[PDB]
Design a protein around this nucleic acid. Structure first.
Ligand SMILES: Cc1nc2[nH]c(=S)[nH]c(=O)c2nc1C
Length: 267
DNA sequence: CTCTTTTTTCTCG
DNA sequence: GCGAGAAACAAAGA
């Protein structure tokens, strides 16, 4: 998932598990709890969930006054709310059991992570990762964005994926953003002119906010999304851009599959 | 059978 | 510092 899918999960969880007391925590794959499963089980058992926040693609469970559980779903992580007698599925790894149901984390590829962090360490945790601003008009300052692009010789798509210019773009939405901003994914950022940077800035915000409103792209929480029907380029290799007959091409850029419309996205 | 395909961090040169 | 490649892992397809 990318930011819109994580935000969709965050909103469904906020409606349903806030106020719930954790009765028990169980793991078939404790190694995904990077801070230590036994410690997490000891600290969080019997605590009440006070809220769910998000930073970039990270979910932040607020559990008691003094702990946050930072969860990253990486490539394929999925949460679901199930009855207490729900059967185990093959890639279920962790469960948080409440009195009237349970929250189960599954992840085929086992990439996702849980980290127990004290409340006053949450902001330092994200500072250390150098996560950039949230993709909103209030937080995403174009002036700083422009200065960072001017000072770099990186290609725009890898640089956007690093999460440092702005948080939350992954492979789907960076391809959508560059198509909307008419920018070649291998364009060196110090070559972007001011008017292109402005369109890129606005397009980042508009694509991600539209995706959030449509519930992201897609049985678990967050599989209700409609954004996949509005994708213009991602995963549409060989299909038309609607640009008078031009077809979408797929290349590899810094190891990632990359979908773009060459007519509209020249360097 | 092999090889490729689908977020973050690490190693190498 | 940089880019390239790969590692963590599972499954599906060519
Ligand atoms: C924190 C971080 N996240 C990333 N996420 C993606 S999708 N691609 C990246 O290259 C990347 N790089 C860094 C350093």
């Amino acid at each position: 998932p990318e930011l819109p899918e994580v935000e969709t999960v965050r909103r469904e969880l906020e409606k349903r598990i806030v106020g719930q007391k954790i009765i028990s925590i169980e793991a078939t794959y404790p190694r995904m709890v990077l801070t230590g499963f036994e410690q997490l089980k000891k600290e969080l058992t019997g605590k009440t969930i006070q809220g769910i926040s998000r930073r970039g693609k990270y979910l932040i469970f607020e559990i008691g006054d003094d702990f946050r559980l930072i969860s990253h779903l990486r490539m394929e992580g999925k949460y679901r709310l199930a009855t207490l007698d729900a059967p185990r599925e093959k890639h279920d790894h962790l469960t948080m059991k409440f009195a009237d149901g349970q929250l189960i984390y599954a992840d085929v590829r086992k990439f996702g992570t849980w980290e127990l962090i004290s409340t006053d360490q949450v902001l330092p945790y994200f500072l250390k990762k150098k996560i950039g601003p949230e993709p909103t008009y209030e937080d995403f300052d174009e002036k700083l964005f422009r200065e960072k692009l001017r000072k770099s010789t990186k290609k725009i798509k890898p640089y956007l994926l690093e999460q440092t210019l702005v948080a939350g773009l992954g492979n789907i939405y960076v391809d959508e953003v560059l198509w909307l901003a008419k920018i070649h994914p291998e364009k060196e950022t110090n070559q972007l002119i001011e008017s292109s940077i402005h369109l890129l800035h606005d397009s980042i915000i508009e694509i991600l906010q539209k995706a959030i409103k449509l519930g992201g792209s897609s049985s678990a929480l967050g599989s209700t999304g409609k954004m996949q029907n509005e994708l213009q380029v991602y995963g549409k290799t060989g299909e038309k851009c609607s640009r008078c007959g031009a077809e979408i091409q797929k290349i590899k850029v810094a190891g990632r599959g990359t979908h773009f419309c060459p007519v509209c996205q020249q360097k």
